[PDB]
Structures are given as C-alpha cells and as structure tokens.
Amino acid sequence: AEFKAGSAKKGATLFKTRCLQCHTVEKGGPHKVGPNLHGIFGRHSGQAEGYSYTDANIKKNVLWDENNMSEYLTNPKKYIPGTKMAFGGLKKEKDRNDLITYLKKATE
Ligand SMILES: [O]C1=C2[C]C3=C([O])C(=[C]C(S([O])(=O)=O)=[C]3)[C]C3=[C]C(S([O])(=O)=O)=[C]C(=C3[O])[C][C@@]3([Br-])=C([O])C(=[C]C(S([O])(=O)=O)=[C]3)[C]C1=[C]C(Br)=[C]2
Ligand SMILES: O=S(=O)(O)c1cc2c(O)c(c1)Cc1cc(S(=O)(=O)O)cc(c1O)Cc1cc(S(=O)(=O)O)cc(c1O)Cc1cc(Br)cc(c1O)C2
Ligand SMILES: O=S(=O)(O)c1cc2c(O)c(c1)Cc1cc(S(=O)(=O)O)cc(c1O)Cc1cc(S(=O)(=O)O)cc(c1O)Cc1cc(Br)cc(c1O)C2
Ligand code: HEC
C-alpha cells in the first residue's frame, strides 16, 4: 500500500463509527474490546501496556507505519490470520487514507 494524506475530518467520522467501539486513542486511555492505540505508529504489534493479545498478533510483530496499517485495515484477518479483531476491513483506498490521516493525528 501507498498511504496518501486525506481528510482527518472524514477519518474521524470513520474512526468514531467503525473503531471507537473497541479502541481509544488518547494517552493513558483504557482498553475497551481492543487495545488503546496511543503511540501505535512507530510501535510493534502486540505491545500496548496492559493488553492481552492473541499469539498471532504478537507473533506478527509488525512495526506499524501508514503503509502496512493501510494493508492491515483493508482486511485484518488476511494480514494477521488468527487475530481476534472482529473487523472485516475497509476496501476503499479513500476510506483507509482518511482514517489513517486521522489516526496519525489522534494517536501521536
Ligand atoms: O465530489 C465528489 C463526489 C460528490 C460528493 C462530494 O463532493 C462530497 C461528499 C460526498 S459524500 O456523499 O461522500 O458525502 C459526495 C464533498 C466532499 C467531501 C470530502 S470528504 O473529505 O469529507 O470525504 C472530500 C471531497 C468532497 O468534495 C473532495 C473530493 Br471526494 C472530491 O470532491 C472528489 C474526490 C475525492 S478523492 O478523495 O476520491 O480524490 C475528494 C470528487 C467526488 C467524487 C465522487 Br465519486 C462523488
Ligand atoms: O465496507 S467496504 O469495505 O467499504 C465494502 C466496499 C465494497 C463492497 O462491495 C463491500 C464492502 C461488500 C463486499 C464484501 C466482501 S467481504 O470481504 O467478503 O465481506 C466481499 C465482496 C463485497 O462486495 C465481494 C468483493 C470482494 C473484493 S476483494 O478485493 O476480494 O475484497 C472486491 C470487490 C468485491 O465486490 C470489488 C470492490 C472493490 C472496492 Br475498492 C470496493 C467495493 C467493491 O465491491 C465496494
Ligand atoms: O473519480 S474519482 O474521483 O476518482 C472517484 C472517487 C470515489 C469513487 O467512489 C469513485 C470515483 C467511483 C464512483 C463513481 C461514480 S460516478 O462516476 O458518478 O458514476 C459514482 C459512485 C462512485 O463510487 C457512487 C458514489 C456517488 C456519489 S455521489 O455524491 O452521488 O455523486 C458519492 C459517492 C459514491 O461512491 C461516495 C464518494 C464520495 C467521495 Br467525495 C469520493 C468517493 C466516493 O465513493 C470515492
Ligand atoms: C472490536 C469489535 C474491534 C473493532 C470494531 C476494531 N478493532 Fe482493532 N482490534 C480489536 C482487538 C480485539 C485487537 C487485538 C487483536 C489481537 O489479535 O490481539 C485489535 C487490534 C488492532 C490493532 C493492532 C494493535 C496492536 O498491535 O497494538 C490496530 C492497529 C487496530 N486494531 C486498529 C483498528 C482500527 C483503526 C479499527 C477501525 C477501523 C479497528 N481496529 C476496529 C478489536 C476491534
């Protein structure tokens, strides 16, 4: 994938409606269904403090960046088989670009 900056505004709507149920983004935020995502960019998978991951997520050991995040969000179970993240994916490039533009800002 080749991330291209999009609309953080639209990305925020995508995050609220599709991700927020399971994830928080702020520093020291709680673990809902999934892990808090503060500082996710530049960190490896399966390493948020206090969260219990699948072995698959931990074994994947991916160093998250905007490009492999886009691939992941296209179809998470195809990128990390065995993950317990219940999310089908976002097929549209624009949606992934907008969401990741938001996520970069919201989790930094
Ligand atoms: O435009 C277009 C179209 C129509 C529309 C519009 O315009 C709008 C919106 C809509 S809905 O339905 O989705 O709501 C439709 C407005 C806008 C918005 C945006 S955000 O960011 O918010 O998302 C953006 C924009 C707009 O306009 C800009 C742009 Br879409 C455009 O316009 C276009 C394209 C683009 S990309 O990204 O893809 O490149 C951007 C154009 C169009 C198209 C269609 Br199919 C429709
Ligand atoms: O909620 S979204 O992710 O935004 C979303 C967006 C669209 C949908 O239809 C579906 C969901 C609905 C949907 C869901 C699945 S699922 O994964 O088994 O749940 C399979 C299909 C499908 O329609 C069949 C299908 C699969 C693929 S793939 O590359 O092998 O994954 C590609 C295309 C397909 O046509 C063609 C296509 C490309 C893009 Br780019 C965008 C769309 C699109 O068709 C629009
Ligand atoms: O050419 S592009 O600019 O690269 C381009 C970009 C995107 C496309 O899908 C399509 C083409 C492909 C595409 C092409 C046509 S057509 O040529 O008019 O026949 C209709 C659709 C469509 O997907 C269905 C469609 C219609 C509308 S509208 O408001 O009623 O006009 C709005 C949206 C729609 O989803 C949602 C949407 C909004 C924005 Br803002 C951006 C995209 C987007 O979805 C991304
Ligand atoms: C619950 C129903 C979820 C939804 C909706 C979304 N995610 Fe998720 N995510 C969830 C879980 C339970 C996990 C852990 C997976 C495991 O196998 O242990 C995750 C994981 C992620 C990750 C990786 C985090 C890390 O490695 O530290 C990311 C980057 C992530 N989730 C992002 C994300 C986004 C952006 C979502 C909206 C599109 C989203 N997830 C939906 C649970 C759920």
Side-chain angles (χ1 to χ4, degrees), residues 22-26 28-54 57-58 61-62 64:
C22 296
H23 292 287
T24 63
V25 293
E26 74 269 13
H31 302 308
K32 302 166 83 170
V33 182
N36 169 266
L37 296 175
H38 175 80
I40 188 65
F41 293 103
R43 179 167 74 229
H44 289 76
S45 61
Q47 294 182 357
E49 292 200 11
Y51 189 81
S52 178
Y53 293 86
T54 61
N57 171 291
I58 298 170
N61 196 44
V62 48
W64 292 114

Side-chain angles (χ1 to χ4, degrees), residues 22-96:
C22 296
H23 292 287
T24 63
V25 293
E26 74 269 13
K27 177 185 72 182
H31 302 308
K32 302 166 83 170
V33 182
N36 169 266
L37 296 175
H38 175 80
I40 188 65
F41 293 103
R43 179 167 74 229
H44 289 76
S45 61
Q47 294 182 357
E49 292 200 11
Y51 189 81
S52 178
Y53 293 86
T54 61
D55 291 335
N57 171 291
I58 298 170
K59 186 62 173 61
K60 185 74 181 183
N61 196 44
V62 48
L63 174 56
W64 292 114
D65 60 48
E66 297 92 322
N67 303 316
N68 54 31
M69 183 69 64
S70 186
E71 186 171 339
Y72 177 63
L73 293 177
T74 301
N75 194 327
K77 286 186 193 307
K78 182 174 190 175
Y79 193 65
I80 311 182
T83 185
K84 64 180 172 182
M85 172 156 144
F87 189 79
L90 293 161
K91 298 191 191 305
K92 290 172 281 192
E93 192 79 6
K94 176 180 183 305
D95 289 348
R96 282 176 282 114

